[PDB]
Amino acid sequence: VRGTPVRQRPDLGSAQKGLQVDLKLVIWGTDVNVAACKENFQRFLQRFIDPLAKEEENVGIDITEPLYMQRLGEINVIGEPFLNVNCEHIKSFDKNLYRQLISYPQEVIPTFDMAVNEIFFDRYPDSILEHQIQVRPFNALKTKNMRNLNPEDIDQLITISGMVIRTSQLIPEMQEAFFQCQVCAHTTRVEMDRGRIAEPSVCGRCHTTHSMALIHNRSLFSDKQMIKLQESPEDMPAGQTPHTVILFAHNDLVDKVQPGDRVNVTGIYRAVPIRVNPRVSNVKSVYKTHIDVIHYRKTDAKRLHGLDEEAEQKLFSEKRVELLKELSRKPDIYERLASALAPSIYEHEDIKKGILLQLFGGTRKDFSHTGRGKFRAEINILLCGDPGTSKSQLLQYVYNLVPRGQYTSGKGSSAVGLTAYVMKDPETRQLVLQTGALVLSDNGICCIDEFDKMNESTRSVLHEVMEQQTLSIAKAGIICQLNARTSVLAAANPIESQWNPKKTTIENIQLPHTLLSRFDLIFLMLDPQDEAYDRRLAHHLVALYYQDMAVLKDYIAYAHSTIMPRLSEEASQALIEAYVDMRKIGSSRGMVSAYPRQLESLIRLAEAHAKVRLSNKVEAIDVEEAKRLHREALK
Amino acid sequence: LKDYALEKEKVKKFLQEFYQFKYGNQLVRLAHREQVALYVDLDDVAEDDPELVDSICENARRYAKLFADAVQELLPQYKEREVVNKDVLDVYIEHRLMMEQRSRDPGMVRSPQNQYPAELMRRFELYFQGPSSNKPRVIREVRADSVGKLVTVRGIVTRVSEVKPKMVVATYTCDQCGAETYQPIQSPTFMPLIMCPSQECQTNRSGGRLYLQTRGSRFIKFQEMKMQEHSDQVPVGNIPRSITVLVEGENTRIAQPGDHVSVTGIFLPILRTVVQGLLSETYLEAHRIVKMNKSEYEKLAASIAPEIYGHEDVKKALLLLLVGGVDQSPRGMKIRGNINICLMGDPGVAKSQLLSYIDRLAPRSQYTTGRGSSGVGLTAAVLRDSGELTLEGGALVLADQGVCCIDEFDKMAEADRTAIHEVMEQQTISIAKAGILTTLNARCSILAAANPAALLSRFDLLWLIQDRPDRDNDLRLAQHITYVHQHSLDMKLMRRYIAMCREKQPMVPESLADYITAAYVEMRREAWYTSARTLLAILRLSTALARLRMVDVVEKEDVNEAIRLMEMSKD
Amino acid sequence: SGFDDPGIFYSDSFGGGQARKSQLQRRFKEFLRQYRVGTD
Ligand SMILES: Nc1ncnc2c1ncn2[C@@H]1O[C@H](COP(=O)(O)OP(=O)(O)O)[C@@H](O)[C@H]1O
Ligand SMILES: [Mg+2]
Ligand SMILES: [Zn+2]
Ligand SMILES: [Zn+2]
């Protein structure tokens, strides 16, 4: 060690004695040796090359060099002192060290820290990190259900997965109190030690008794963050409601993950007693428990790349980038992806191209200089179709596939419940503002089943978000404006739950024109009585009965990363001409008459298709396809 | 009164000697730590000694302490090998007794309060199961006179908290000495300690300053469950009385909301703390949990509610759902193996009675009429509990895996109608309401009843019952019901056959692909409302009929009977 | 259950210029047990 500071580990827990005992010299209560665990992890660091390291999924990870050594090299070239120690790599290497770490985290981890700092500073003498490297051990063997956890895993590193609900304000807590003598101005720092400070009680200089006063804002504080999180268990017993768990983040992990984000969370399961009343210092026999956090895994093999994941530069290998680019250059890329989306359902090519264009999303642009408000860049789809037509299953599939996906169904909702509401947090007791689905879906998708049965007091909420993406809560709690930039995937039944063919489109839909003009795509899911289609659908469904994702998500991620298509002269003139054409056509009543909103719809759909093709310029093909899809969707 | 050293000797000799060594095998298994809980049986103890049994019935808690310590001392001679120390808790107890041996000095005497206590170092738990002679008493009737007495009760569950770690023996460590003191907890609350009575501290005259931690402590699986009188138990006009029950160790996570339970325990008090005296709450400390009375082909279907006549195809489809179509999750998208039936009917054909019988039948069942369960009654809501906004469930989420028998679906509230549409379509319930932001999981199957389009378009079977007056039909039914009043398969056996039938998991054969596609297109032409939902209906009914046959392969007979049922329903 | 209160049971101090009084009592114990007078 050169002398870099040893900043304490608030998230690991309060310190302890570290009592050791001979049976060589293990830690009391544990089958651990500091020397053995330290040396085993030093071996793991120096010699652990992968059996397989897919460069495509693990960019920057080779199959030749020892794995974590080049990680230490990058932690030398840049200044963040954190090392991602995959617990399953440890499981493959040394099962004993897995047992010791995922039974005794707060003591095995500091030894791992010591070893890493020692090896790193041996390798690089003149490298300077702000403090010691810290090991983030994650991807421990997934416990499925918190409700099926036992009281034997207290302080034992677990992992679960779920979506956030709230990330409350920072809360400082003491780490090194500052004291000054009121009489003689003698100063002293007092380190927080094992959960409580030591008030000096005598001046060190003038020996006055209890003249030492605690100066607050000279002290040292690490931060905190209550992060209320809703679990997504993979085990759902017969009637276990959605479990929700409190997460206390600390100095480095605070405000790294927002509400609505979906995360695996690996962290220390920590029981803490409950005070009987807020002022009495008694406690309760019946503890609470809350997971701590040592790591959030953002990546999911079922979902697509997140927003910050797309934003970060070093996300894709050059080979993967070239694979995506040539896959784009292949002419039938759009129809290949529309076929890929939801493989179960049988050849809804038009609807799937539309849903794909939604998922890619239109181009983002700034109108602050123009002062035209904020131009909604998202896309919105209305699957208007007869009941029992797999529209609801499309809703479920896309909701699962997309991150930042929220879900509503008819009048299982309310205006305040979608916007926001003030309620007291029962752990801090302050009146806090909890978000709704329309704020959790801020940069994602809201899937709304039973969209007709969503009585207009609620669709009043949808109006503002669909026109300008702002959601102004004006209430005795707060008078503020929540961002709600949600793409919408609405599902509507016709009146009387069957598409009468006598009634025309608007007459059958029966929704307000000021709402139906907001959805920039409307699909009339109808069933022609093609017996060939019936036979083929039967064979498809029974086929799945008797019975790629990575490239798809990486493709969409690259598109969002560095594809922001712009209009061309050809595309603009075609857009004007096609808008006039559609206006002339739909001027006939019954059908949805065109609007400047529909001009915006055409522009956005063209931008989305250009994003799909990576053209970096909206083309006549794009605008022609947008026109074609709009017509064939509405017809 | 008696001498409890004599009683402990009695039960020690008993546990060693009673029977294959009945209790001996259990004792050696727990000695090796192949079981963590134990259960005394007062029938098995009345096998020899009745006075001890009557005393246990009258002062059960003390004898619980006796039995548990007796087995604790019987432990080590039954121990025969080195156990693998499966828990960090095992590591702690082994380390503790190791250092006690190290600094033993066996001649040296130690105080009456310097020793690792039983409640800490036991690592097993001992409960009971009251005798058959002990009649289960009414929850209302378990009064103050029955405090301390051993008592069994039978009641329905209303709501059950989760498993949070109750403290049993808190462990404190010092700032100077290094010993480890214990605070054995008993009550709902404890004042922490701040000073260490270790004799090194008493010698040093040092500040104790001991700090509690969870590492060396002893937590336990603790739940507080609620229970409710049986509606048959209830007197003429009073509402059903409730009761709080406390669940510990290997009694945890047995009962669940809505499931009938029989709990055997003792009715011990807690401090109440405005009239003088010394008042006290009452909780029943559970010591054996047994769900009972709901959750323990042609002749079979006719056995489904023999008191109803006719509707033979209806009963067959009901049997079919009760077996359940094959649960499928292929390629991520879920094709749930639930079967949804609606019974539209003329006023009065015993459709409500059919729903009630299915409610009494299924291992999970919830019979909800129109407005008794509306809004939160069907959905899930929020309630104060460790006080907290516990989100708990209504009817459907209580019936998360079972059968919701919905009665008079026609006149339900429109929000209830919307929720039921959601659960039939996707077996979830999304909510973004005032204080709730959830997506409940409800894998339920719907049995709607109603009186005469969305119904037709979202279902697997709709059945119109029109009792067209036919003289011979009504004559036979009249004779039948009059005979029923005149004279006034077994349900358990029926449910056992169904329970085994649930788990054969057939997979469709390729030979029937042509047959099923041909039948689908032919039914479509005969229609020309049928669609892919009706395709999935025939296909699910085929899978379920294969399950009823118990063979793992569906055949032509199955699809034939499925089309027979649907034709009968539509016509 | 709050009716009774059993004691606070405890154990020994396993593990762990100015000396401490337990050590000094120990030194007196060793001095008074093991002190030899006379000669072989
Ligand atoms: N075969 C039968 N066996 C038993 N009860 C019958 C039979 N036929 C008619 N009933 C009587 O019909 C009455 C009405 O049934 P109910 O469940 O109310 O039908 P719904 O509620 O659909 O109108 C019941 O009280 C029942 O006793
Ligand atoms: Mg009825
Ligand atoms: Zn001073
Ligand atoms: Zn002490």
| Integer Cα distance of B161 and A388 in angstroms | 38
C-alpha closest to that of A381 among A448, A473, A477: A448
Strand partners, A480: A473
Give Cβ neighbours of residue B438 (< 8 Å, ≥ 6 apart): A230, A241, A242, B380, B391, B429, B430, B431
Distance from CA of B306 to the nearest CA of C (A): 51
Ligand nearest to the CA of B345: 1
Asked if the Cβ–Cβ distance from C14 to B182 is below 8 Å, we say no
| Integer Cα distance of A370 and A362 in angstroms | 19
* A226: three-class secondary structure by DSSP: strand
Contacts of A387 in chain B (CB under 8 A): 454, 457-458
- The first and second tokens of residue A363, run together, are 């181009």
Contacts of A450 in chain B (CB under 8 A): 418, 421-422
> DSSP string covering B190-252, please?
EPPP-S---HHHHHHT-----EEEEEEEEEEEEEEEEEE--TTTS-SSPPPPEEEEEEEGGGS
Ligand 1 pocket, mutate which of B315, B346, B353 (most atoms under 8 A from CB): B353
Point out the residue among B100, B102, B113 whose CB comes nearest to the CB of C9: B113
Taking residue B421's Cβ as centre, other Cβ atoms within 10 Å add up to 23
Ligand nearest to the CA of B406: 2
* B217–C contact, CB cutoff 8 A: no
Interrupted after residues, chain C (C–N over 2.5 Å): 16
| Integer Cα distance of A55 and A554 in angstroms | 13
| Integer Cα distance of A575 and B331 in angstroms | 40
**The 3-state secondary structure of B458-469, one letter per residue:** CCCEEEEECCCC
| Integer Cα distance of C9 and B180 in angstroms | 9
Type of residue numbered B350: A
CB B294 within 8 A of CB B402: no
CB B23 within 8 A of CB B15: yes
Question: Alpha carbon of A60 to those of A54, A57, A291, A317: distances in Å?
Answer: 10, 10, 31, 8
| Integer Cα distance of A593 and A586 in angstroms | 5
Type of residue numbered A296: Y
CB A437 within 8 A of CB A453: no
* B447: three-class secondary structure by DSSP: strand
| Integer Cα distance of B25 and B15 in angstroms | 11
Q: Is the CB of B75 under 6 A from ligand 1?
A: no
* A549: three-class secondary structure by DSSP: helix
**Helical ranges in A341-479 per DSSP H:** 349-360, 391-401, 415-419, 437-440, 456-468
Q: How remote is the CA of residue A180 from the centroid of ligand 3, in Å?
A: 8
- The first and second tokens of residue B52, run together, are 């001890």
Q: Is B37 annotated as a binding residue?
A: no
* Residue of the CA atom closest to atom 12 of ligand 1: B350
Give Cβ neighbours of residue A586 (< 8 Å, ≥ 6 apart): A592, A593, A594
CB A47 within 8 A of CB A74: no
Question: Alpha carbon of A380 to those of A266, A444, B431, C21: distances in Å?
Answer: 36, 11, 21, 80
Asked if the Cβ–Cβ distance from A387 to B458 is below 8 Å, we say yes
Residue of C nearest to B118 (CA): C9
Instruction: Give the dihedral sign, CA B373/B374/B378/B383.
Output: negative
Q: Is B61 annotated as a binding residue?
A: no
Residue of B nearest to A498 (CA): B453
- The first and second tokens of residue A618, run together, are 């909206």
* C38–B contact, CB cutoff 8 A: no
Q: Is the CB of B305 under 6 A from ligand 1?
A: no
Residues B465-473: contacts with CB under 8 Å, at least 24 apart: B465/B311, B465/B343, B465/B344, B465/B345, B465/B346, B465/B349, B465/B351, B466/B346, B467/B346, B467/B349, B473/B310
CB hemisphere CA count around B399 (13 angstroms): 26
E strand or H helix that includes residue A158: strand A157-170
Point out the residue among B115, B177, B183 whose CB comes nearest to the CB of C13: B177
| Integer Cα distance of A351 and A116 in angstroms | 53
Taking residue B525's Cβ as centre, other Cβ atoms within 10 Å add up to 10
Type of residue numbered A377: A
E strand or H helix that includes residue A264: strand A262-272
Q: How many CB pairs under 8 A join B and C?
A: 85
Question: Alpha carbon of B230 to those of A324, B135, B156, B233, B310: distances in Å?
Answer: 66, 15, 7, 5, 32
Question: Alpha carbon of A619 to those of A148, A329, A510, A568, B399: distances in Å?
Answer: 56, 15, 36, 6, 55
Asked if the Cβ–Cβ distance from A21 to C15 is below 8 Å, we say yes
CB hemisphere CA count around A364 (13 angstroms): 8
Q: Is the CB of B350 under 6 A from ligand 1?
A: yes
C-alpha closest to that of B84 among B36, B26, B33: B33
In chain C, count of helices (H) and strands (E)? Answer: 1, 0
Write the DSSP symbol of residue A79. Answer: -
- The first and second tokens of residue B186, run together, are 């008993």
Give Cβ neighbours of residue A249 (< 8 Å, ≥ 6 apart): A11, A224, A225, A227, A255, A256, A293
Asked if the Cβ–Cβ distance from B508 to A546 is below 8 Å, we say yes
| Integer Cα distance of B394 and B279 in angstroms | 34
Give the phi and the psi of residue B323 in degrees, each rounded to 5. -70, -40
* A453–B contact, CB cutoff 8 A: yes
In chain A, count of helices (H) and strands (E)? Answer: 20, 23
Distance from CA of C35 to the nearest CA of A (A): 31
Type of residue numbered B236: V
Give Cβ neighbours of residue C13 (< 8 Å, ≥ 6 apart): B177, B178, B179, B198, B199, B200, C22
Residue with tokens 């709902």: B188
Helix, strand, coil percentages in chain A from 3-state DSSP, rounded to 5: 35, 25, 40
Instruction: Give the dihedral sign, CA A19/A25/A27/A28.
Output: negative
E strand or H helix that includes residue A627: helix A620-634
Q: Is the CB of B449 under 6 A from ligand 1?
A: yes
Asked if the Cβ–Cβ distance from B190 to A195 is below 8 Å, we say no
* A74: three-class secondary structure by DSSP: helix
Give the phi and the psi of residue B342 in degrees, each rounded to 5. -125, 140
CB A113 within 8 A of CB A1: no
Strand partners, B44: none
* Residue of the CA atom closest to atom 24 of ligand 1: B350
**Helical ranges in A452-548 per DSSP H:** 456-468, 505-509, 513-516, 531-546
Q: Is B309 annotated as a binding residue?
A: yes
Distance from CA of C17 to the nearest CA of B (A): 16
Determine whether A235 is exposed, middle or buried from the number of CB atoms within 10 Å of its CB (0-12, 13-18, 19+). Answer: exposed
Write the DSSP symbol of residue A63. Answer: S
- The first and second tokens of residue B81, run together, are 């090998």
Distance from CA of B327 to the nearest CA of A (A): 11
C-alpha closest to that of A560 among A404, A399, A345, A352: A404
C-alpha closest to that of B383 among B391, B375, B395, B394: B391
Contacts of A390 in chain B (CB under 8 A): 532
Ligand nearest to the CA of B306: 1
- For the CA atoms of A436, A438, A439, A445, the dihedral, rounded to the nearest 10 degrees, stands at 130
Contacts of A21 in chain C (CB under 8 A): 14-15
Q: How remote is the CA of residue B353 from the centroid of ligand 2, in Å?
A: 8
C-alpha closest to that of A433 among A474, A492, A392: A474
Q: Is A392 annotated as a binding residue?
A: yes
- The first and second tokens of residue B410, run together, are 């026609």
Q: Is the CB of B309 under 6 A from ligand 1?
A: yes
Q: Is the CB of B117 under 6 A from ligand 1?
A: no
Asked if the Cβ–Cβ distance from B401 to A413 is below 8 Å, we say no
Q: Is B533 annotated as a binding residue?
A: yes
C-alpha closest to that of B269 among C4, A276, A277, C6: C4
* B419: three-class secondary structure by DSSP: helix
Residues A588-593: contacts with CB under 8 Å, at least 24 apart: A589/A504, A590/A504, A590/A505, A590/A506, A590/A507, A591/A504, A591/A505, A591/A506, A591/A634, A592/A505, A592/A506, A592/A516, A592/A517, A592/A522, A592/A634
| Integer Cα distance of A109 and A442 in angstroms | 37
Asked if the Cβ–Cβ distance from A20 to C14 is below 8 Å, we say no
Say how far residue B427 (Cα) sits from the centre of its chain: 21
Distance from CA of B172 to the nearest CA of C (A): 10
| Integer Cα distance of B95 and B75 in angstroms | 18
Rg (CA), chain A: 29
* Residue of the CA atom closest to atom 10 of ligand 1: B350
CB B460 within 8 A of CB B339: yes
Residues in chain C: 40
| Integer Cα distance of A293 and A245 in angstroms | 11
Phi-psi label, residue B392: left if phi above 0, alpha if psi -120 to 50, beta otherwise: beta
**Helical ranges in B384-531 per DSSP H:** 395-398, 414-426, 454-457, 471-487, 491-501, 511-527
* C26: three-class secondary structure by DSSP: helix
Asked if the Cβ–Cβ distance from B85 to A31 is below 8 Å, we say yes
E strand or H helix that includes residue B431: strand B428-433
Point out the residue among B178, B388, B432 whose CB comes nearest to the CB of A426: B388
Q: Is the CB of B347 under 6 A from ligand 1?
A: yes
| Integer Cα distance of A634 and B11 in angstroms | 83
Q: Is the CB of B481 under 6 A from ligand 1?
A: yes
| Integer Cα distance of A504 and B557 in angstroms | 45
CB B229 within 8 A of CB B139: yes
C-alpha closest to that of B121 among B261, B225, B235, B218: B218
CB A630 within 8 A of CB A602: yes
Give the phi and the psi of residue B134 in degrees, each rounded to 5. -70, 105
Residue of B nearest to A197 (CA): B209
Distance from CA of A19 to the nearest CA of C (A): 7
Rg (CA), chain B: 30
Residue of C nearest to A22 (CA): C15
Chains touching chain C through at least 3 C-beta pairs below 8 angstroms are A, B
Chains touching chain A through at least 3 C-beta pairs below 8 angstroms are B, C
Say how far residue A128 (Cα) sits from the centre of its chain: 33
